[PDB]
Protein: Phospholipid-transporting ATPase ABCA7
Amino acid sequence: FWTQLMLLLWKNFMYRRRQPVQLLVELLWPLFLFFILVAVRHSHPPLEHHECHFPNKPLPSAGTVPWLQGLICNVNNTCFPQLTPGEEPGRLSNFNDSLVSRLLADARTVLGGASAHRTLAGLGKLIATLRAAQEPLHSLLEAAEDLAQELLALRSLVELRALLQRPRGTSGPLELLSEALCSPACSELIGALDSHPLSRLLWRRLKPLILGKLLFAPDTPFTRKLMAQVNRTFEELTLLRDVREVWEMLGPRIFTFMNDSSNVAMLQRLLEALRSFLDPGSGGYSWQDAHADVGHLVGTLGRVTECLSLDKLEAAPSEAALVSRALQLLAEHRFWAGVVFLGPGHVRIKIRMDIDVVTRTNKIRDRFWDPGPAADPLTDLRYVWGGFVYLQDLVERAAVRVLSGANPRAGLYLQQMPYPCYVDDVFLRVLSRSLPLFLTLAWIYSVTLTVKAVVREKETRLRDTMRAMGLSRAVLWLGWFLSCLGPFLLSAALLVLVLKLGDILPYSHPGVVFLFLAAFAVATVTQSFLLSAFFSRANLAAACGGLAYFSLYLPYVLCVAWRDRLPAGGRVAASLLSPVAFGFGCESLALLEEQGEGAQWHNVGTRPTADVFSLAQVSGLLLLDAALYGLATWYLEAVCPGQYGKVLVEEAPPGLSPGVSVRSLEKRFPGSPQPALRGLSLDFYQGHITAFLGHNGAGKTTTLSILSGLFPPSGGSAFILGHDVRSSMAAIRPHLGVCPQYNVLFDMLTVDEHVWFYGRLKGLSAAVVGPEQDRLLQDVGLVSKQSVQTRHLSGGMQRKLSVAIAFVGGSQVVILDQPTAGVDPASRRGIWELLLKYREGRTLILSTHHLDEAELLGDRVAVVAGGRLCCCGSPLFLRRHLGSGYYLTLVKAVGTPQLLALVQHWVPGARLVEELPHELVLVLPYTGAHDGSFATLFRELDTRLAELRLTGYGISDTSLEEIFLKVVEECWALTRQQLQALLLKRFLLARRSRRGLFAQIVLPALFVGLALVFSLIVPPFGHYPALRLSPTMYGAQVSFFSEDAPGDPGRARLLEALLQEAGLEEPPVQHSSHRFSAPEVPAEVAKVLASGNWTPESPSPACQCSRPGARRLLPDCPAAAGGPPPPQAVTGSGEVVQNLTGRNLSDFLVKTYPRLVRQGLKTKKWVNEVRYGGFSLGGRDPGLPSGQELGRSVEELWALLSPLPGGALDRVLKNLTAWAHSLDAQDSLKIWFNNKGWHSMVAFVNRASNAILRAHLPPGPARHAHSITTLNHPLNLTKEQLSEGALMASSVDVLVSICVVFAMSFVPASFTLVLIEERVTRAKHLQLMGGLSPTLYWLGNFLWDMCNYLVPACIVVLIFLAFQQRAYVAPANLPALLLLLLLYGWSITPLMYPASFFFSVPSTAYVVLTCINLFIGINGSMATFVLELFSDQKLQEVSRILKQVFLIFPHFCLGRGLIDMVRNQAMADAFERLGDRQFQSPLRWEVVGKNLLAMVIQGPLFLLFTLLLQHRSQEDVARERERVVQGATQGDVLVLRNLTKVYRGQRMPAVDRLCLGIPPGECFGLLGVNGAGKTSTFRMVTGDTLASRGEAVLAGHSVAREPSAAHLSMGYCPQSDAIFELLTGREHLELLARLRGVPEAQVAQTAGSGLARLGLSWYADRPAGTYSGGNKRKLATALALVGDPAVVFLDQPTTGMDPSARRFLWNSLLAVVREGRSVMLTSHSMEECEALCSRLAIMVNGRFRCLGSPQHLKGRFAAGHTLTLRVPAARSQPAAAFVAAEFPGAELREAHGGRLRFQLPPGGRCALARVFGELAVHGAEHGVEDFSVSQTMLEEVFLYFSKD
Structure:
């Protein structure tokens, strides 16, 4: 266990050690990704803030001066870390320091006491007038003294005198106003405002207020009453203009009584008074200064008040005319707002202002929650500077004034709810949506090398060998898991260090987050294992693994999008995937970081919030997912049960040793109906090599599997060395070795540690492996190839290293399986010598499928058929029981009956079978096997052979082939039909692969439709809806009404009305005493409150803010902060009201704010706050009014000082009566708004006004018959907002525009993968053989390309019609889409062909092509659309001009044409309400026609591109060479001359200047080893690559003359299975028949003859997948010879098939040679050449060595006469003594205990009779079993091939 585990770990580590660049890019890809992430983090630093309070903003219902005050001063809306005085419960105004309020209070405090001092003057004037028609003089002197000293004791007048006696230069008028606050004259004022940017922006908040309009649409007298009440703040605002002309009748007039008129003034002023009156001089200024300054100030105020409207109120009786007039006034910038009295009693009010002026009204809250008060007056405040709530409250007060019948003096003070000190970091807000994507993209590569490696080791079937040879699958999975956890954990450690040290996750102990990432790694590596168990294809699974991994992350996106909707149980159930369980854990980590405390060991086991996981509750879930994936892999490994994805016998050797004795196995595949094998009872012997012949998979693999360690023996007895598989299975393994049919090698390993690996696993120790290793590496002969340390660089030789691995243990039993299939003949003798070296003392089971080596290697031979044993034994006469015993061949370079008679006088048993020219074959039967009779026959035959005119003889014994065959049965128009053949063949290829076409057609065409039909979640841009205004649209919430100075009945009435409007039913008093229900106070917190010095007006104790070094979002404090829980009550509408009377009211809200947000803080998408707005029924402003005596004084001046009958002075005085009497402001109100809720301000303003209406109303049906509900609905559009609502939103159109490219990219790649597997499989070769020009082949197949592109275009067009889409249903834009799609498909096909000629695997080509096409699609659509919209400057416009003219990508113009047509539809839809005149034909040539022109002109270029790259191709040795050079043979079909190969890169010619001539009537048997240039020689006669140098003509026709003429009479047969798996045998025959122009009457006859010549009646409609290799090779040969070729090409047609199929194969091709057709052969098993043909040729390293007729070469260097013997005593020397005494040759080979072979000197003219009768006594001389003379067969040369 523990040895092989560490050995497998070493084996897996050596893979990555040998492949370093994959490991290096593995280590440096997520480092680059997370360096990008840390650059993003460093680009956006965290930002903190202090506790934020906000100043009071008065509304014009509170008077006029505070409204200006708040507008001019509080324009910036600056924050305040200290408390503003406007939030204290007592004060309402916060401008004691202001000069204007100081002036108001000073006037009210010095004019209050001057009541008697002016009535005294009045009565004195009255009595002086009475006496005319000296007490008052001195009395008024003292009164004037008192008044002058009262006036002069004021510091504010000196301040305004110094401020007003200042120049009009650098600052301007607005700064002069704000210093004391905090017509061409109008043109100069506007120029002064525009002179400074500060005054410019302050006028930008004021020019709609000054030059705006109020346009009320209905004109009933109710609306006229409304407007005549709301203009009372407008028409009476400019009343100072009136007092201006008061100076114009009083200023100069008294001036005319002043200058040169001191006589009337000296008398009263003379009779400390005169120094107080300031009698004028050089220094005393009292009269001229006063007149000049008063005139200057009144002129300044008049010129400031020159260009107000004086009637901004206008009218319009039509709402459409209202919209048009508003548009015009916007065009000249003179519009403010439109009141609409759209009624049905109650009053409904619409406000219509511009979009720049009003907040958007589509949604209520935000969509991504920013954690601040959000008070920036430019961005989200629009109800203040824009001028909504001013108007709003003005019309509200007018409506309540006209509906109440009274005049409520209830102002409004808007006030922002203060915010605690926050920290705004966007990065830490989105880390829950970023890090689970960035880790998955970091490990989308690192999974695709685990699936790739595991499937690759499941594909070469070496894992089956390791499982059979001693391993357990548990050890395999343990080794793979422990080896793949390496890179995952290393990358996890690196990407934990990066997160901690890059400030991405600060405050966090890296141990817990590293444990978290290890819990993700251990849950994704087994995810990769489960993904790998699906497949059996290496590159296909490697490509599909990343897609299937990243397609499981998208549930996390789908869950984070709709987090609030689903409950916890569904979250747990959907957390059973690997990345989603990491996603929720990362959300919990980010939200735990969010409260400042990084992940540490204190808080692992606690949920940070009530609806998220914990770190411990996730790290236990990933392990559960890992266990589930492992269990599912364990279950799914059983999807492949077992598999992947007559008594004529003798058992009596002299050496008996049943080391592997087996009896009667029965096995049964579940899918076979017959048993896997039948019973057999034979046993094997060590010292023998028992050959095991059979059929293709019908016994040549299953028996050797069941006697190995793989298959279990449920049936049969298989005792190996006494014990069976079912019991021991442990000690046999050191004595057992195996070698299956496939290679058992490691691809990236080398040889020395390979044999060390197998030896160390087999049980050999490390101290004894080396002495095995050196002799193993030298027995194979790889000492030269072990120090170079190469594995993949040697090919075909590796079969030797497949069999030497079976000898690493010195095992007594070795089981081979077809060890001679894929090996060159130069190493066949090498492996045979290896087995002969290792044949002594070992039980060799060599189940070769060939019959040309069992006679050499096999001491005994067993033959099985279908699982049934036919016969077994030594290959001598004891098993050679055939009637035709021996075959005599008398050869010529005369007369059958004379020689037949001669045999008949000698031996009458005879048989004449063959009487062909130059060879006569007789049959001597074994019946009468008297060697003396044969000797006495051959004596006369020797004396007759010289004069018989033959001069040649050769007599074979019975071969193993015929006894095997005996025992096997006991157990223009021509081009048009080329197009027809091409289209029908492609049709049958397509029509069978059902699910592949189903995927590659149905997924994109329905994917576009599904994406468009479910991508309507994007909001439709356009008009903005009207919105009802109330706090009831926010749902359930809280509010408060904290009142101050409640000593009034009116304030109680207003409070009761506010409560009744708050959804609270007014209860009876016995239940209204406890109407509220105070909640429980925590007693352990109540003791903290009592311990502290707390009263309900004292501040809350503390709240821990963001420490330096530990930053939080919202400060942490328990219930001690925020005071006690205030009393509360519940309403019927779900609102809560909280009596907050007598608190700090800002040390409460700031402290209590975060605990309300903590419920909705979980996802931060749509955070339902609960505290949106409150109230405060504020009482009296603290300060003495003294306005009662001011009203008395102003009425006394009205009735005393010149009462004008016209009322010019009198109406000013009467307005001053209200200015002084209503200056008390007997009640006031605040409105505490929130700004995260967009509409809280004006909704609570409307609520306050409704409360005022309810308060000032008598009972009855009028309290509910009087209500007013304001609305908010902006204008339709203006000129630039036509484009804004039509073109710069554009999300749905661009998403479908990218989506059609996204989906239509995957359709034509199905062509590319099919044509690249047509490339790498050599089918393209065999359709290039014929009349098919490659240009003709291409023009055959793009017609099919358009034919199959006709499929998805109809589906997408009809599904675009079916959705009733506005841009695809009308008959003007539908044909544009149709033509664009059709020409786009015309243009996308020809550009993807030449990637196949650069690529290898269809899966790799698929994924690379779709990656590059997807990338260019997203680039050329989105980047271009983003460049051309939201423009910046001229450089981008110049860049996009070139980007939209060059247009070289087809997807670029598809996307741009579709976007252009859909924006034409959008602009027409926007135009249809305005003055359109819009025909808008989408088929314009300058709009979309350039795209179709570019497609129709660029398509042929790529059509010819793949053609132009494809058509770049534009003694007997001397006795043949000199004959061909000196003369060309026209009778010979094939003439080759200068067969020289210029290899690119190898720098060496293959064959050195040799020429050939091939006669047509015979077959030419060519043989070539690797490196002798065979495939190239087939290749240029084929004509694949360049035809530059070398003459090669066939049938008198030149390849250089016509290339297609060289393919008509050339029938190729590759070793590659160049057949379609979805099309059966008769259909290849039919397809080739129509490819050769066979007439339709002869097509069926040709197909039937082609199938039935080589069987195929049962294999007719059977698919090509369910064939054998022999069946596929034999139908390839039949396809090669069908079509009438002059020469038939067979390149390696024989690789291990059943020799019965060989019998019919060379029977059929011998018949076709007798028909007169030449045939080309080249293969590794050269017995076929001597079995069928009549001419042999060999070349090694491209040099001809024989090049002659095979019998002449046999007379030259072969054709010796040999002998095989059989002796029981194994005493070879006594036999060899007389045998070498009889014959002069005394060689010896295979002097072994089985048998003995002997070779005599070749070419003996004397017959072999001199031994035969000699044997007839000499075989009786010693103990001899049997003899078989192996003299002059054709097969003797293979022994030559076994020698040298």
